[PDB]
From a paper:
The resulting 3,6-anhydro-d-galactonate is converted to 2-keto-3-deoxy-d-galactonate by ZGAL_3156, as measured through the thiobarbituric acid (TBA) assay. ZGAL_3156 did not demonstrate any activity on D-AnG alone and is thus a 3,6-anhydro-d-galactonate cycloisomerase (dauB). The crystal structure reveals an octamer, not uncommon in the enolase superfamily. A size-exclusion column analysis confirmed that ZGAL_3156 constitutes an octamer in solution. In the enolase superfamily, the active site is located at the interface of the two domains, the lid domain shielding the catalytic machinery from bulk solvent. Two disordered regions (17–26 and 138–143) were not modeled. They are close spatially and constitute the tip of the lid domain. The residues involved in the coordination of the catalytic cation (Asp194, Glu220, and Glu246) and the predicted general base (Lys166) and acid (His296) of AtGCI are strictly conserved between AtGCI and ZGAL_3156 and have similar spatial orientations. This cation was modeled as an Mg2+ in ZGAL_3156 and as a Ca2+ in AtGCI. The residues shaping the substrate-binding pocket in AtGCI originate from the TIM-barrel and the lid domain of one monomer and from the loop between helices α2 and α3 of the neighboring monomer.
Carrageenans, alongside agars, are the main cell wall polysaccharides of red macroalgae and play vital roles in the development and physiology of these photosynthetic eukaryotes. In marine ecosystems carrageenans constitute a huge biomass and thus a precious carbon source for marine heterotrophic bacteria (MHB). The marine Bacteroidetes [name] DsijT, originally isolated from a healthy red macroalga, is a bacterial model for the bioconversion of algal polysaccharides. Here we describe in [name] the discovery and the integrative characterization of the complete pathway for utilization of the kappa family carrageenans (containing 3,6-anhydro-d-galactose units, mainly kappa-, iota- and beta-carrageenans), which is carried out by a complex regulon including a dedicated atypical PUL, lacking the susCD-like pair, and carrageenan-induced loner genes including distal susCD-like pairs.
Numbering used by the authors:
A (entry chain F), B (entry chain D), C (entry chain G), D (entry chain A): 1 to 16, 27 to 137, 144 to 315, 325 to 376
Write the structure that this text describes.
Amino acid sequence: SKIKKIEPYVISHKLDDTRKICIVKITLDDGTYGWGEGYGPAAVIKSGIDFFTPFLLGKEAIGHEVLWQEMYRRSMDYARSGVLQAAISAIDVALWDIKGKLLNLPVSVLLGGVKNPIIEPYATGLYLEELLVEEALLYKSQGFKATKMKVGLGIEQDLKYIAAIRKAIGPDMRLMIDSNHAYCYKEAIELARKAEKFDISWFEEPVSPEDYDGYKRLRQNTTIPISGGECEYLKYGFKRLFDKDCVDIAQPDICAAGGLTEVKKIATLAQTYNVDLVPHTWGTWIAISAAVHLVANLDLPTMELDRTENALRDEVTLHKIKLENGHLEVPCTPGLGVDVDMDKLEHYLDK
Amino acid sequence: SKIKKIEPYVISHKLDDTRKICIVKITLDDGTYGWGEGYGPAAVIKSGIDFFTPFLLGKEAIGHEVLWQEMYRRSMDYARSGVLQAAISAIDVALWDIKGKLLNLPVSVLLGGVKNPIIEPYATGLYLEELLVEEALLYKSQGFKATKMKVGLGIEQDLKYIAAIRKAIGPDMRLMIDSNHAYCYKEAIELARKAEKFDISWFEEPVSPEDYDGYKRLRQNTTIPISGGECEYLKYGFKRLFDKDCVDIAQPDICAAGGLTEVKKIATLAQTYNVDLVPHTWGTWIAISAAVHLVANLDLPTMELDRTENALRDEVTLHKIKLENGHLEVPCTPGLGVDVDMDKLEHYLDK
Amino acid sequence: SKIKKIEPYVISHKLDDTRKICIVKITLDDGTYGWGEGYGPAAVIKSGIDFFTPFLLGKEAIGHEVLWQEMYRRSMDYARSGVLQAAISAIDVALWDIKGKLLNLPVSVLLGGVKNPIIEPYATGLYLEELLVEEALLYKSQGFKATKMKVGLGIEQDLKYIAAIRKAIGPDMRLMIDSNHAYCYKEAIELARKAEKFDISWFEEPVSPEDYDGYKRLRQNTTIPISGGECEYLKYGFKRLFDKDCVDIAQPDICAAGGLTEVKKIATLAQTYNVDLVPHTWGTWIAISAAVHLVANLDLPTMELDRTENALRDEVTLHKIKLENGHLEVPCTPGLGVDVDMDKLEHYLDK
Amino acid sequence: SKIKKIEPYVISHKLDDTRKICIVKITLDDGTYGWGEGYGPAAVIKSGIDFFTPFLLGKEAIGHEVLWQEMYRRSMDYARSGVLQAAISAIDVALWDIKGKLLNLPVSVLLGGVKNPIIEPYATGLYLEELLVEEALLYKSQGFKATKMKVGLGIEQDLKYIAAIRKAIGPDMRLMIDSNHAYCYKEAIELARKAEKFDISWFEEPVSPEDYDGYKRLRQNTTIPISGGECEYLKYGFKRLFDKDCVDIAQPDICAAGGLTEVKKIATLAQTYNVDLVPHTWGTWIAISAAVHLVANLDLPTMELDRTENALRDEVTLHKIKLENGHLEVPCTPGLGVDVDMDKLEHYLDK
Ligand SMILES: [Mg+2]
Ligand SMILES: [Mg+2]
Ligand SMILES: [Mg+2]
C-alpha cells in the first residue's frame, strides 16, 4: 500500500531527429506498479522526479492528493510553470494507474464515472508538398472523422496547403490548424480570415501563450474557434487564461499541467467558465491512456491522437484500448490499462 | 569570441540539512571564462543547462541577447517559470561576466552606468529564541543599517519575537519580516496590524505568490509596505504582478527570473509602473555580484546579503567586493568581479 | 574619456520649401567624437542641447544612462514630451556613437546583439497625379519590397490614387498609407473600409495622437493594421498608448522619444505588451543609422527609409551601410558607422 | 487689427544661482502692445516663440483662438507638453492683454466675468533652519492667511521643520507642503501620515507627475488634500489626470499649460470633474496678472504669490494690482494691467 521505488526512464530514438521522452514506474511494497509520463525535456523531467522521490517513498499511494500537495508544498517556490510540473504530472498519472489497479476499477470510473464510453480522436500530421495530401487521404481511409495539420510555413504557403488538404478530404471530414505560436496577431488574423472558407474546426496555439490580449482579439476578429493552453500550467494558470476570455477550447496536457488530479481541477474550472476542454497529448500510450480516461469522465468527444512516427509510443508502451473506423473505446481494465515492454524499454533507453 | 565549453557544477554541503546550489562556467575558444549561477533545485537546473548547451556552443558571447532569445525560443513551450528559467539565468549571468572581462569593464557600467557606487545591504537571519536576539545584536555591531527576519512560527509567536528583536536593535536600525508564503490573507493582516508598532520596513512574501488579490487587499489594510516576486519569472510575470497593484517593492532573483538581461528588462517595467526594485539574493558570490552590479545600475539603495552559515558561498566563490560599517562598495574590476577556488569546487561537488 | 565639447548645428536647404534639421557632435578630452540627431524644430532643439550642455561637460560618456538620468532629472518638470525630449535624444544617439567607437563595437552588438543582420526598409513618397505612379514604379525597379504613401487629400481623392499606385506596383509589393493625423475617426474608417481591397500593410497616424479611443475603435472596425506613436514620447507615453490597445505597430522616433536608451526601454515594453515596433525615421543618416542598429537588435524586419529629395541627409552625412535590391545590411563598424562632411556642414547652415 | 511684431526677451538675474525667464511683447499695426510670459527654460521658450512668429504676423489679435489653433496645428506633432506649450502660452497671455486693451476691459471680465473681486493669495518660501521660522513670521505679520513651504530635505528633517513653522504661525494661519516630486509613494505617505497633526491644507506635487497610481493611492491613505498638475499640459493632459482621480486640487500654470485660453478650457473640465483649481504661478507680474484675472473668473479664493527674491519680477515688470493685509484686489484696468520698464528690460537682458 506504500511506495517502495519510483523509477524514471528517459527513452529515445532517431527516425528522420530524436524523440526523447521521460517515463515513470512507481511500485508499491506489494509489487503493484503504476505507469506515468511527463511532458517536455526528458532529462530535465527525469531529474525533477528524482527531486520528489525522497519525500514520496514509504507514503500511501491511494491518498494521491496528499502526495500531490506534498510535491506542491516542496516545489511551489521553484515551479508554477514548466519542468517541475511535468515531474509532478508524471508521478500523478502513475498514482492513478496504481489506484485504478489497487481498487480494481479503470481511471475514468475512479475520476467520477464514464460519461462517454466511445471517443472519436483526431489524427495529427505535421510536415514534397503532395506527400501531405497522401498522409491526409490515409487518415480518411483509416476511418478518422477529423485531422489536425501543422501551419507556420508562411501565410501564403499555408493557405496553398490548407486548400490542397481540404480538396482531398472533401467537406465531411473535420480539419484543424496548429501554428505552434509561430505567428503574431497580425499574421494570425491574416491566416484566419483567409482560411475561413476551408471550414476550419479550430486554430491551435495561434499566438504566443503570453499574448492573452492577442488571443482575445483574434477570437473577436475570426469565426474559427481559438484553441490554447498547451503552455498553461495548474488551476491558477488556466483561471488567469479564462478570466481573459482567450480560448473557445482549453488544451491542458495531463503530463505537463499537473497530472490527472490537476487536469480534473482545470476541468471543474473549464466547466464553471463554460469553456470546452480537449486535452493536449503528444507522448507514449501511457500519455494517451490518461487522456482516454479523462475525456471519458469529461461532460461524441475528441482527443489528440499522434499519428506521427514514434516507436516509444508503439513499441515501448502496450495499450489494451481498441480503435476501429475513427472510433476509440474506453477500456474497463483496472488503472490506465497500460504496460511497458521492458525489453523494448532497455533497447530504447538513453546513455 | 565563440563559446567552446559550458560546464555546470552541482556543489553540496550539510551544516545543521544540505545546501545544494548549481553553478556554470562558460569558456570561449580564447579561454575567456565567465561564472554564472541558477536559483532553485541544483540537479534540475544542472540538467537544464545541459539542455541548452547543444544550441549555445560555437556562438559569440558579446551578443548575449541573441543567445537569450535562442534559449527562450527553445524553452518557451516547456518553461515560462521555474527550473528552465534558472538554467537561462545561470548562462546569462556567466555571459555578463564574459562580456565584462571581454570589454574590460564591470557589469554595472556595461548595464548602462554606475548610478550608486555605494550600496547598504541588509542582513538575513532565519531561525533557543534568545539566540535570535544575539544574531541581531551581532549585525548592528557589524555596522548593518537593516536586518531581515524570518516569520511563520505563528502569529502570537512571531509578535513575541519581533518585539524582542526591535527591543535589542533599538529604533535606529531598520527591520523587515519574511513569511515565505507561510500565511493566508487572514493570518497576514493579523500579523501586519499587530507588528505595525515595531516599525517594519516591509513584509516579504506575505501570502501565496498565486494570491494576487490577497497581496492587493493586504496592501490596502496595512501601513507596512508589501514585498513580493521571489517566485515571479520573466518580464511577462512581473507585468501581471504590477497590473494588479500587488507590491510596493518587487523582488526578482537574477539567478531565477531570467538573469541580468531579464532583471534589467523587469527594472524598465518596474520603473514605468513606478514600483521599487530590491532583488532577491540567496546563493554564492556569483549571485551576490550580479545583484551588486544590478542595484549599482538601478535608479542609498539596499540588496539581499545572506549572513547565514554558508561555506558553499564563502569557500567555493571568491569575491573582490569590500564591506565596512554597513556600506558595500561596487567593484571596478572587469565582469562580476568573482572567481571559483577549483580545489574547494572539487571538494564540495556532488556525485 | 570625459566630455570636453557638445556642438549643436542647425542645418538647412531649400529645394522646391526648406528642411531645417538639428545635429550634435559630442567630443571627448581624447578627441573621440560622436554624431547625434534630434527630431522636430531644429532651432528649438538646438537651444535644448545648449540647456543640458553645462551639466554634461567633464562627465564620462560610457555610463550614458547616468547622463540620461541627469538630463531627465533636470528637464522632467519642463519636458515630458516634445522639444527637450529631442534634445535628450540627440545627445543620447551621439553617446551611443561614442560608446560604439570607445568599446570598438557597432551599436546593435552594444544594445545586446545583432538579431537581424539584414533589414528590408520601405520607401516613403509624399505628394500632377501621374508623377506619383512614376515615383512608385522607380521604387519597385530599385528592388524595394514595400512603399509608404501619403494620404490626406480627401477620402475620394486618396482612394483614386491608392487604386493607381496598387495598379502600377502590382500585388507582390507591400503598400502602406500615412494620414499625418489629417483625418478624424469617421473620415479614417471611411478610407480604411474602402482602401482594404488594395491590400494595405498598415495605416500610419490615422487620427489625432490624442484620440486614443479613436485608434482602438478604428482597429476594431478595420482589417488594415493601425500604426502610431510618431508623436509619443518616453516609456511612460508608450505605456499609456499600449494600455489602451491603440496600435498593432508602435512607431517611436529614436531622435524624438528619448534616444537609443529610451527607444530600447520602449522596445522592452512593446515586447511585454506583445506589440510590434517599427521606428519612425525622417532625418539624416545619423538618424537612419540609429534605426539600422535598433531594428538589428529588435526581435525580415523593416524600417523607415526616406526616399524624398534631401541633401542634408545625402550630402552633410556620410554612411557606411550598403543597400542593394530592397535589402539593407547592418554595418560592423564601431558606433553608428556615420560621419559628417564638415565642408558640406559649413555650406548648409543657419545665420 | 493685425500683428506687426512679436518680440521675445530672455531676462537674467543672479541673487544667492541665476533666474532666467522669457517674456513676449506682441505689437499690432496700430501700436497696441500686449505683454506675455512663458514658464520653463527661457532660451528654449524664446526659440519656440521664434518658431511660431512667421505664421502669426499679419493676422488679427481679437480672434486669439484662431491663432491658438494655428500654433497648435503647427506644433502638435512635436509638442503635446513642455517647451512649445510655454511658447504657445506666452503668445496667448499677450493676445489676452491686447484684447483687454483693444476692447477697453480687464481680462477677468473678458473671460466671462469677475466672480471674485478680492482674492487671498498664499506666500511661497523655500529653503540656517531658524531663518525659515523668521520668513514665515514675516508673512503672518504681512497679513497673509496661508503660506506654502518647500519639503524634500528628508522625512525626519521636514517633520522637524513643519513642526517649527506651525509652532511660529500658530493654528489660525493655513500651511501647505510642496515636495517637487522629490518623494516616492512610500516616502510620501510616511511624510503625509506624520505631518497630518500639523493641519496641512494640501500636499503639492507629492510624487512624480508620471506616477498617477501613486497620487490616487496617497489620496486614499492620507487626510491631507493632494495637489498636482504643475507638469500637466493641455485639456487632454488634464482630462487624463482627472480620469484617474489623482488630485483634490488641479494646479495648471497659465504660462506653461496653454495660456489663458487653455487654462480656461482646463477650468471647464475641472468643473465637470468637480475638482478644485488653484493655478501654479512662479514668474513676473505678467504671469501673476494672468492668474489674478483667471481666479477672478473662476467659480475667498487663493493663488500662488511668489514672495522670494526676484528682481526680474519686481523691477522689469510693473503691476497696478493692490495687496493689503493678505487680500489682493482684482484690477479694472484694460488687459492684464501690466507694463515692462524698458530700461530695466535692456539692463537685465541676456547675450
Ligand atoms: Mg499544438
Ligand atoms: Mg525572501
Ligand atoms: Mg509619418
